[PDB]
């Protein structure tokens, strides 16, 4: 009924993102399931507003680290599940090198028996024919490490990491992420020692789906504490 107890089996997920990049407005809805005992997420996302103005891979990090697999010996370092069901606010600034910036604010919490991630995203200062609004990024997403640290001042957790997006010409587009998470409720939460999350992500399509969409499968495991 609280915290890690809510994640002992498969949990259904709803995601909603309201976005605006250089004034291009869009809306994304995602649905599927997560299982934190194995660290597995399975989700399908649809743009309801027509063709997205940015590449799907640039939205992956924004679109529920509560589904990370924390090994038994690291369970006291799992902030994300400890904040549940009331949830947490997740905020980022994402700097695309030599291009624009996204700022995001999300609330991740339970809604009934479902976990929901509700997001607002604003992007500014993008190049219209750059790698992002020019759609020059490959449809894939490579493995990354996200180091997590406690943010005691605020009873939450911070992370800083750089996503490397492959570009169609063989170059790499860097996206520097700054993240802060805050609990929504004022019950106690776990504040972790430094550790990281290891992620893999594979992106695919539904050949029967006519809307602009992304099918995603991810495995994530926490590590770095022995
Ligand atoms: Br931030
Ligand atoms: Cu459902
Ligand atoms: Cu409802």
Residue pair 121/103 in contact by the 8 Å Cβ criterion? yes
Ligand closest in space to the Cα of 160: 1
Q: Resolution in angstroms for this experimental structure?
A: 1.6
* Token pair belonging to 96: 């695309």
Ligand closest in space to the Cα of 14: 2
CB atoms within 10 A of CB 148: 27
Distances (CA, A) of 108 to 15, 121, 130, 167: 9, 15, 31, 31
Distance 12 CA to ligand 2 centre (A): 5
| Closest C-alpha among 41, 27, 33, 1 to residue 14 | 33
| Closest C-alpha among 40, 43, 11 to residue 28 | 43
Distances (CA, A) of 162 to 57, 83, 95, 172: 14, 26, 9, 12
Instruction: Please tell me the distance from the alpha carbon of residue 199 to that of residue 53, in angstroms, as a whole number.
Output: 26
Distance 26 CA to ligand 2 centre (A): 23
Instruction: Please tell me the distance from the alpha carbon of residue 90 to that of residue 138, in angstroms, as a whole number.
Output: 27
Q: Which residues contact 208 (CB under 8 A, 6 or more apart)?
A: none
Distance 159 CA to ligand 1 centre (A): 9
Question: How many Cα atoms sit within 13 Å of 34 on the Cβ side?
Answer: 25
Distance 31 CA to ligand 3 centre (A): 13
Instruction: Please tell me the distance from the alpha carbon of residue 205 to that of residue 217, in angstroms, as a whole number.
Output: 11
Instruction: Please tell me the distance from the alpha carbon of residue 59 to that of residue 102, in angstroms, as a whole number.
Output: 10
Distances (CA, A) of 202 to 10, 31, 173: 20, 16, 18
Instruction: Please tell me the distance from the alpha carbon of residue 194 to that of residue 149, in angstroms, as a whole number.
Output: 5
Q: Is the dihedral angle over the CA atoms 65, 90, 46, 162 positive or is it negative?
A: negative
Structural domain harbouring 20: 1-226
Ligand closest in space to the Cα of 111: 3
Distance 209 CA to ligand 1 centre (A): 35
How many structural domains are present in the chain? 1
Distance 161 CA to ligand 2 centre (A): 32
Distance 205 CA to ligand 3 centre (A): 28
Please state the φ and ψ torsions of residue 66, each to the nearest 5 degrees. -60, -20
Beta bridge mates, 76: none
Distance 226 CA to ligand 3 centre (A): 40
The CATH number that applies at residue 207 is 2.40.155.10
Instruction: Please tell me the distance from the alpha carbon of residue 177 to that of residue 80, in angstroms, as a whole number.
Output: 18
């Amino acid at each position: 009924r609280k915290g890690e107890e809510l994640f002992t089996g498969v949990v259904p997920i709803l995601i909603e993102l309201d976005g605006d990049v250089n004034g291009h407005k869009f809306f994304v809805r995602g649905e599927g399931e997560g299982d934190a005992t194995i660290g597995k997420l399975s989700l399908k996302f649809i743009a309801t507003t027509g063709k997205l103005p940015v590449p799907w891979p640039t939205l992956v990090t924004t679109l529920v680290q509560a589904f990370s697999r924390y090994p038994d010996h690291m369970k006291r370092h799992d902030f994300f599940k400890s904040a549940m069901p009331e949830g947490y606010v997740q905020e980022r600034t994402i700097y695309f090198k030599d291009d624009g910036t996204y700022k995001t604010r999300a609330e991740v919490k339970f809604h009934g028996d479902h976990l929901v991630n509700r997001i607002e995203l604003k992007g500014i200062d993008f190049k219209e024919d750059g790698n992002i609004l020019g759609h020059k990024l490959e449809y894939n997403f490579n493995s990354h490490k996200v180091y997590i640290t406690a943010d005691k001042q605020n009873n939450g957790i911070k992370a800083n990491f750089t996503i490397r997006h492959n570009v169609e010409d063989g170059s790499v587009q860097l996206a520097d992420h700054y993240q802060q998470n805050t609990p929504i409720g004022d019950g106690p939460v776990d504040l972790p020692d430094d550790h990281y999350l290891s992620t893999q992500t594979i992106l695919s399509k539904d050949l029967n789906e006519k809307r602009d969409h992304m099918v995603l499968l991810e495995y994530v495991t926490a590590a770095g504490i022995t």
